[PDB]
């Protein structure tokens, strides 16, 4: 009776589609005749953070907007001062294959994970001044692609074994495990309120989950290929995704449907990192064409190009202050742009 | 502002100590040579890494071993702790010197999957610059499978009917011209992929490896040597 179930699912998804078409009374770009284009944006590399031997695969900013963690594939987790270009820390990792790094909102801890298939947490504010790993989270069975601290005790971890998880660091066990995805969830983003989070997977679907109740609130499927990069809009209502389709997509949770498609004919490489500026008017997108782009998120136009890297842009972040944007890349340097 | 100046001086001291440690680590990093080992359940890549290993126990996802030949460090990653999809974690290995590719050469039905994996690795936009040291494994078992009959390699590969042996080594594969005609047919099947693309950026280095072979460390050595040589000769563009 699997065919009856398939047609039942097709009926309910056509109900979802008709609800989305009822939402789609007018497209966003039609309403925005009266908005002023941003026009011209150029951003210059204020600091070239050079200290990494291998390709930089992740970065995370600080909440102080100055102390950023970065992760490269030689085995170094380097915490940099973005202001004075000083390497305040450089941890040797146990396994060099890390694909994500996290910086705690308090700034007390950092985290890492990847092909070691373990989320390690390192205590920055140690008593002795020598940073040590606090605990390892060893419950995932794929790889690790994104981790974010909710606080100094709760951490949510995306993975290659199709499941996100949320962990108690002091306990060491998964407080919950989000097991709705079909394949290889690659990036997760936290809402401002940290009550619900979004995550895109290689099943071309970006899904909204509730933190406390451990279930998938909503599912979005507009992309055609693997999703590599997700971030909420700064208010928490919308979120944009960067997929291997070579297009970015802006979905809104309250409408359950995509709003914008940021793409162009002359871009045929997958977005590897995405980010929203503090206003959300700028959507910043790493790329495999060796250069970042910056988009106006409200008209789907290229506001500007951030071309400074010899290799693909593997990571991309913006400060909570909104002054800087750091782009790491596979050419082993970060660059900070205003 | 005086304690502010002390804070900046302590920051500069931290940066100097960190960068000295990073030079100390960069030397070892460039001294070692990374090798992504790839294979399948059929392919005896665990046996191959065992000959470079033997001649503590941990389940931390992926095997990651060390061997050394003529004072050169070789650091070889068996990624055996992930799912059977590999199109995202293979991007982490765009900077490895040589991808090892171990293939069970006896099982002809698995070989189309092996060549499909090889063709994916060859044409991947991040692995298009990494040379592959193909290790066609289990030649002593392929000899049994071809000399025993009752396994129709022509029915597994129809191109084998119209194939002739180009070249051979005399003592070790040259006992029988049938199994030899088998084994190079497998080899050329991968080489037809390797020469189909890649403008001098990467090369296949196929080796006929038995179940036991103590020389695979030296084969990886002498092929990584040619790989480094060929890229040094490729910044010159004498082509």
């Amino acid at each position, epitope marked *: 009776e699997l065919d009856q179930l398939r047609q039942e699912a097709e009926q309910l998804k056509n109900q979802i589609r008709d609800a989305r078409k009822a939402c789609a009374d007018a497209t966003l770009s039609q309403i925005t005749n009266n908005i002023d284009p941003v026009g011209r944006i150029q951003m210059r590399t204020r600091r070239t953070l050079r200290g990494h031997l291998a390709k930089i695969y992740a970065m995370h900013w600080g909440t102080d907007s100055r102390l950023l963690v970065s992760a490269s594939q030689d085995g170094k987790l380097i915490i940099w001062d973005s202001y004075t270009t000083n390497k305040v820390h450089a941890i040797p990792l146990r396994s060099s294959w890390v694909m994500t790094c996290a910086y705690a909102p308090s700034g007390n801890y950092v985290a890492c994970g990847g092909l070691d298939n373990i989320c390690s947490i390192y205590n920055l504010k140690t008593r002795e001044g020598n940073v040590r790993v606090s605990r390892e989270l060893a419950g995932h069975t794929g790889y690790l692609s994104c981790c974010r601290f909710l606080d100094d005790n709760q951490i949510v971890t995306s993975s290659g074994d199709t499941t996100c998880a949320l962990w108690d660091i002091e306990t060491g066990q998964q407080t919950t495990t989000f097991t709705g995805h079909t394949g290889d969830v690659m990036s997760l983003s936290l809402a401002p309120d940290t009550r619900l989070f979004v995550s895109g997977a290689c099943d071309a679907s970006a899904k909204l989950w509730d933190v406390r109740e451990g279930m998938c609130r909503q599912t979005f499927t507009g992309h055609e290929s693997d999703i590599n990069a997700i971030c909420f809009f700064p208010n928490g209502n919308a979120f944009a995704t960067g997929s*291997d*389709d*070579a297009t970015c997509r802006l979905f809104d949770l309250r409408a359950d449907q995509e709003l914008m498609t940021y793409s162009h004919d002359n871009i045929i490489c997958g977005i590897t990192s995405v980010s929203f500026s503090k206003s959300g008017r700028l959507l910043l997108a790493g790329y495999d064409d060796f250069n970042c782009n910056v988009w106006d998120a409200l008209k789907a136009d290229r506001a500007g190009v951030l071309a400074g890297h010899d290799n693909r842009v593997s990571c991309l972040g913006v400060t909570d202050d909104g002054m800087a944007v750091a782009t790491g890349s596979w050419d082993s340097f970060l660059k900070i742009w205003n | 502002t005086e304690d502010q100046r002390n804070e900046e001086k302590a920051q500069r001291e931290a940066n100097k100590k960190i960068e000295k440690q990073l030079q100390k680590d960069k030397q070892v990093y460039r001294a070692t040579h990374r090798l992504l080992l790839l294979g399948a359940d059929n392919s005896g890549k665990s046996t191959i890494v065992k000959q470079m290993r033997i001649l503590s126990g941990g389940t931390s996802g992926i095997f990651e071993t060390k061997f050394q030949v003529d004072k050169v460090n070789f650091h070889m990653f068996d990624v055996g702790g992930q*799912r059977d999809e590999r*199109r995202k974690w293979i991007q982490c290995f765009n900077d490895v010197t040589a991808i090892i590719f171990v293939v069970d050469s006896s099982d002809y039905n698995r070989l189309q999957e092996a060549l499909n994996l090889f063709k994916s690795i060859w044409n991947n936009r991040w692995l298009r610059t990494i040379s592959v040291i193909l290790f066609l494994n289990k030649q002593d078992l392929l000899a049994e499978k071809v000399l025993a009959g009752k396994s129709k390699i022509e029915d597994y590969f129809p191109e084998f009917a119209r194939y002739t042996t180009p070249e051979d080594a005399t003592p070790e594969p040259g006992e029988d011209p049938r199994v030899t005609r088998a084994k190079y047919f497998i080899r050329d099947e991968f080489l037809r992929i390797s020469t189909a693309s890649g403008d001098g950026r990467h090369y296949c280095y196929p080796h006929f490896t038995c179940a036991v072979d103590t020389e695979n460390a030296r084969r990886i050595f002498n092929d990584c040597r040619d790989i480094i040589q060929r890229m040094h000769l490729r910044q010159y563009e004498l082509l």
Partner: nanobody
Amino acid sequence: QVQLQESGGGLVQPGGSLRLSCAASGFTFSNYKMNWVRQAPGKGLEWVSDISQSGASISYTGSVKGRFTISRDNAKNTLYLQMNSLKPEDTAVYYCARCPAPFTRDCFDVTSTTYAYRGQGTQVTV
């Protein structure tokens, strides 16, 4: 959403003829390399054929090289497997698998797990 539905099949005596058609919606069909993958009962999955973006580059596995023929039309978003001179070794579920990315010649589509852009399925029995 992305869908890949297969039409055709049923039961055919050995030596017959058949033609599977995949209607694939949810993407630009031309920009991707399409594949036909089978699953014989009591086995895993194993790739059968593939066709490039424009249809120029074509390949089949070492069993169905002369018999079957892959084809595609991109203005109809359809991928055909013309099956001729069928065999009892050809009884399998047939999925039109898609390569995971556009504009690339690398594909990872045989996976024993639930690959995302594989089709739903079709019993073809001989």
